[PDB]
Amino acid sequence: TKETVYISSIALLKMLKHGRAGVPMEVMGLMLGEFVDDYTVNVVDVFAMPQSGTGVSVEAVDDVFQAKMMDMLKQTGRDQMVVGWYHSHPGFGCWLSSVDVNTQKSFEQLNSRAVAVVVDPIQSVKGKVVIDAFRLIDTGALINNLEPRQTTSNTGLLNKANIQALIHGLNRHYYSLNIDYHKTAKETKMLMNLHKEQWQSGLKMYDYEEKEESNLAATKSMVKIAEQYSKRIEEEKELTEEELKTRYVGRQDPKKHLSETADETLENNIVSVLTAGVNSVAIK
């Protein structure tokens, strides 16, 4: 009647390398894991399908591609049971694809635990994974009327227009789910220490101070030349006797002539504090 979707970190990003930044003509693939229906959902092992000229087709659904993939499950040690399939579509407002559901229908009778999780490679640019799910009726009141999404209040699903209001009548062909992310201890602090912001920057002792010979005088020229202009412009703009407030130029005119000059003085003061003094760590 109601479920909840949880996806780990390793299974979160694989295809999205091809989906997000790997341009359109998206691929599909199989998800693996173990869970209990109607309560929780788990996805661990994921591997994609081959790409063809027509995209998703019968050859990708065929198990000949999976025949050699299932042999690699026991060899690499990573093996699970089929929890569903995943796809992508370029942000269709209504009825992404009816072909992916037909693949879900044929594989539903043999599993009934399969969950179809599709993500939009277009509108995911914001960094947040677009949540959409297609599933057959679990324990049916859906043949007439039922409300999916355990904790029916939850949060507004957003999206756009059509399929948001089509949940009631089309519930047989559309089963809504709220997708959530989770990570274990080895997926939390282990990856954070090697990522944080930008990169990990191994061997922190590497800096630009070893490159400083003529640029030391160039830094002294940047804290003077561009700074002398900020001193005259600050007095030139404030000298205006008009005021009158109201609107005029006040959206941001004065920033560059008044306030940003204070920030421009700080921009050269930040690089001055950047290396600061005695950055050779004591010694001589």
Binding site: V125, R251, Q252, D253
Partner: protein
């Protein structure tokens, strides 16, 4: 700012109204009043330079850099001329 992203629609500046609120002329001849993004630099505006809008929402995307030059007007320079003045 990322909600806009790839569907860039080239606009044109018209005239400011309020902080983060202004009208933006469009290349189709239909002026639209959209909320100006607070990240955008508001000292770079001129009633010349083109801007970026959206397909559906038609919202101002990003203030274009000096690289906003459009070659539809054939914007370029002279490379190794021939006729000599002397």
């Amino acid at each position: 700012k990322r909600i806009q992203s790839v569907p860039l629609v080239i606009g044109q500046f018209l005239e400011p109204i309020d902080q983060n609120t202004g009208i933006v002329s469009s290349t189709t001849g239909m002026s639209y009043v959209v909320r100006i993004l607070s990240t955008l630099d508001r000292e770079l505006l001129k009633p010349s330079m083109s801007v970026a809008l959206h397909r559906h929402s038609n919202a101002l995307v990003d203030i274009l850099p000096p690289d906003s030059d459009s070659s539809i007007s054939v914007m370029g320079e002279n490379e190794k001329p021939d006729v000599t003045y002397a």
